[PDB]
Amino acid sequence: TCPFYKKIPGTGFTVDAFQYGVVEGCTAYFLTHFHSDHYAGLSKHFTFPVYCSEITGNLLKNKLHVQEQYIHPLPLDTECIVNGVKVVLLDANHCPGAVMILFYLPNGTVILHTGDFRADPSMERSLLADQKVHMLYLDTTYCSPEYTFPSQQEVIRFAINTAFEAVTLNPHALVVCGTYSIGKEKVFLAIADVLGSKVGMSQEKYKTLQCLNIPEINSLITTDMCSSLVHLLPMMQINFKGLQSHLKKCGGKYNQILAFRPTGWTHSNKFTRIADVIPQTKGNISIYGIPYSEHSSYLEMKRFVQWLKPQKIIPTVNVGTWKSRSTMEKYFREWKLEAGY
Ligand code: NI
């Protein structure tokens, strides 16, 4: 059965609710982004209307085989009527095609569902500026002050300089980047660009990237591994065993691997600056864990919420324990008393 925080009161709408069977009274199913926890349950046998971005719609059709008649793509930044209710989709600054949804309820209440997001000050100059929000359904993944990490631009700076240095010292080094879902593509794209290479990958991953509307993509990626010195591999293979095994397959073209594991936050954030980061090393194999987040830091989240001044907050992440729920409610109250709403 569908939980409460995935229902939109006063509408026939649900958000990210495909794993519960047929939801009683749902006339339109919204999908915020193509991440498995959120799409869990969609397939070619789905026969209700799905509302989403163009990019999410490209991925439903080609990767999950959902039939075209049930895919309803909406443009961003545009007032649209769905089943008699005004909605807007806004860029979530999460992975490609990810959105927040503004719902204008028939009774005058305004609801923002963030999906998954990385709050940014640029959101304070979207269509959100214009009006009040009564309920916020908030991505609270990192809602605790210990959760700190750098900007995405600092992390990319570190990865580009690390890769360029290592391959300039050894032209026979191979760079490898881990992936398991969409998102974080700037990591491997930026490194390939500095090195003058295309990014090499499997047919399945190439298919996924071709759904993302990335400008000039055909110039940036390929399935011909031999011609590329930046390779993608599944995240589970980013370890000394998996990487050794991959170096054997390359036919004596390379004598070193430098690899990157983009993670979310890890506890080495609590001590080490991004500048000071070091790899794990065995022989001619080195592995860097880099904290490239597509979710808000605690400070980013707090800033966004203090600016929006919602009348009520409903968390959508970390809701399963009493301790987590109590912790999050305490921070929402400090934020509210500090800013005076
Ligand atoms: Ni996500």
Side-chain angles (χ1 to χ4, degrees), residues 1-23 25-203 205-215 217-240 242-247 249-269 271-281 283-311 313-341:
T1 52
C2 189
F4 77 98
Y5 76 80
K6 302 173 173 270
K7 284 168 182 170
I8 307 295
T11 62
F13 303 155
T14 54
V15 180
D16 302 345
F18 300 89
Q19 65 164 304
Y20 309 104
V22 183
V23 179
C26 182
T27 57
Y29 295 80
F30 288 75
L31 188 57
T32 60
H33 66 296
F34 195 81
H35 280 163
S36 57
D37 275 6
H38 300 259
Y39 70 69
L42 272 162
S43 64
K44 64 158 77 162
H45 308 298
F46 199 76
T47 48
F48 298 98
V50 183
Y51 289 85
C52 58
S53 66
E54 171 178 7
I55 288 161
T56 297
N58 293 345
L59 291 162
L60 300 177
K61 177 186 164 176
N62 296 283
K63 297 293 284 186
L64 290 184
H65 304 295
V66 172
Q67 298 174 44
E68 191 136 55
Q69 70 190 142
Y70 307 110
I71 306 173
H72 294 278
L74 304 173
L76 301 179
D77 301 327
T78 303
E79 294 186 329
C80 293
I81 308 299
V82 175
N83 297 356
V85 178
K86 180 159 79 163
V87 305
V88 173
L89 302 188
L90 306 166
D91 205 282
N93 190 41
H94 186 48
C95 59
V99 302
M100 320 188 283
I101 313 161
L102 257 192
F103 297 94
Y104 290 83
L105 266 43
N107 71 5
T109 298
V110 181
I111 293 178
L112 175 63
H113 196 305
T114 63
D116 282 349
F117 89 141
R118 189 159 180 175
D120 193 75
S122 63
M123 302 169 171
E124 306 168 24
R125 295 170 286 284
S126 64
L127 309 200
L128 293 174
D130 310 33
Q131 100 285 278
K132 176 175 187 65
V133 174
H134 303 80
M135 313 204 79
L136 179 62
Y137 288 69
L138 178 63
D139 168 13
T140 40
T141 297
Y142 294 128
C143 188
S144 201
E146 73 278 15
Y147 294 121
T148 63
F149 35 70
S151 64
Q152 292 178 163
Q153 198 277 334
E154 288 171 86
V155 174
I156 288 303
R157 172 90 283 195
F158 174 86
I160 290 167
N161 292 358
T162 301
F164 183 79
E165 170 170 313
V167 170
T168 300
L169 293 167
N170 182 192
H172 302 273
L174 176 65
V175 185
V176 180
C177 289
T179 187
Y180 42 34
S181 54
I182 63 161
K184 308 191 187 182
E185 288 84 8
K186 194 71 172 172
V187 175
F188 57 81
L189 297 168
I191 282 167
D193 168 273
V194 76
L195 296 179
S197 187
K198 302 198 169 171
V199 186
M201 61 198 64
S202 71
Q203 289 188 263
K205 188 74 190 182
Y206 182 90
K207 180 172 185 189
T208 302
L209 294 184
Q210 285 291 153
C211 303
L212 308 183
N213 293 347
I214 290 174
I217 193 64
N218 296 325
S219 67
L220 315 165
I221 66 182
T222 181
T223 53
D224 182 8
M225 307 298 293
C226 283
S227 82
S228 145
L229 58 132
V230 181
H231 296 173
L232 307 191
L233 285 182
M235 197 75 88
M236 285 196 80
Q237 187 155 8
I238 309 306
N239 46 65
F240 298 121
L243 292 168
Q244 284 163 190
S245 171
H246 185 72
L247 189 61
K249 286 160 245 168
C250 294
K253 211 163 180 300
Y254 306 111
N255 64 11
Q256 184 184 351
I257 289 185
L258 177 99
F260 294 93
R261 295 187 341 87
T263 63
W265 172 95
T266 70
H267 188 66
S268 36
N269 272 272
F271 302 130
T272 328
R273 279 179 143 63
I274 185 54
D276 298 330
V277 167
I278 61 162
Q280 283 203 202
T281 295
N284 59 350
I285 307 182
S286 284
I287 303 164
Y288 285 87
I290 61 175
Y292 190 96
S293 179
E294 296 184 335
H295 293 276
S296 315
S297 77
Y298 172 87
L299 290 166
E300 293 166 353
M301 191 191 302
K302 181 179 178 272
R303 180 184 166 117
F304 179 80
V305 174
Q306 292 181 315
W307 170 86
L308 191 71
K309 305 181 164 54
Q311 284 184 11
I313 309 172
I314 298 156
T316 65
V317 186
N318 308 302
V319 295
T321 76
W322 298 109
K323 191 197 184 187
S324 272
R325 297 188 139 296
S326 187
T327 290
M328 290 185 294
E329 288 173 351
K330 268 163 49 257
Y331 288 123
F332 305 151
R333 178 67 69 194
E334 295 182 1
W335 296 352
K336 183 182 155 85
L337 293 168
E338 183 191 10
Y341 58 101

